[PDB]
Amino acid sequence: SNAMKLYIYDHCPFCVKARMIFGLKNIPVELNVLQNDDEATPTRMIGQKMVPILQKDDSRYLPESMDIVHYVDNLDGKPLLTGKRNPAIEEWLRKVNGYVNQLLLPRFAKSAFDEFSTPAARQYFIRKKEASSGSFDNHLAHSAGLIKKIGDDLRLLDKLIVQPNAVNGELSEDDIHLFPLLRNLTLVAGIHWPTKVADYRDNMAKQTQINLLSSMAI
């Protein structure tokens, strides 16, 4: 038995990270999606508006995706995170995460994630992102080129994925960082997915108990 709760936004890759170990280890967790404009709830918990937040069995709260990942992986004394990391994956992720939000943010803002269920929450998101990283319409109008870019980058990634259940052969923090990106990329209609990338994406979604977004791709 456990009483763990995880406060999230469904679109947030850090929140996906925090959910992964629960799925991989079959540890129950109660997901609670917060409205994107809700400052008060997370502030009561941790003193700031940030997700993910884990509520531990003792009722105390733990923020920071990777701290949650390691706490939960370590709680039973037998971690699954046993593998080496590949500097090439860190580099690839840095490069892709540098431009990918031009595809993702405009699509998140148009999609049925629970954190955007109210018009106010959706507007809050749009306003904040557009005031920081530019026009959603401009980015959407550049989709063809951006889609070709991610397709090209995915072809290299394909050659680096060792197997569908571990990017480097044994599960590592590279899986924790890679899967959320691939999972959010399934919201982007038009991408050419290489075989090994698709197999890893599909298997990891199954093993982590985290849905892909293909059914609402746009």
CB-nearest residue to ligand GSH: 12
CA distance 202 to 212: 8
Which string of DSSP letters, residue by residue, matches 33-61? EPPTT--HHHHHHHSSS-S-EEEPTTS-E
* Residue from 25, 64, 143, 153 binding ligand GSH (CB under 6 A): 64
* Residue from 13, 42, 52, 63 binding Cl ion (CB under 5 A): 13
**Closest to Cl ion by CB, 87 or 98:** 98
Tokens of 52: 């993910």
- Please choose, from the candidates 77, 66, 81, the residue with its C-alpha nearest in 3D space to the C-alpha of residue 180: 66
| Beta carbon of residue 172, minimum distance to ligand GSH (angstroms, whole number) | 17
Peptide bond into 52 cis (omega under 30): yes
45 binds ligand GSH (CB under 6 A): no
| Beta carbon of residue 161, minimum distance to ligand GSH (angstroms, whole number) | 23
106 binds Cl ion (CB under 5 A): no
Give the interface with ligand GSH as residue ranges (CB under 6 A): 9, 12, 14, 49-52, 64-66
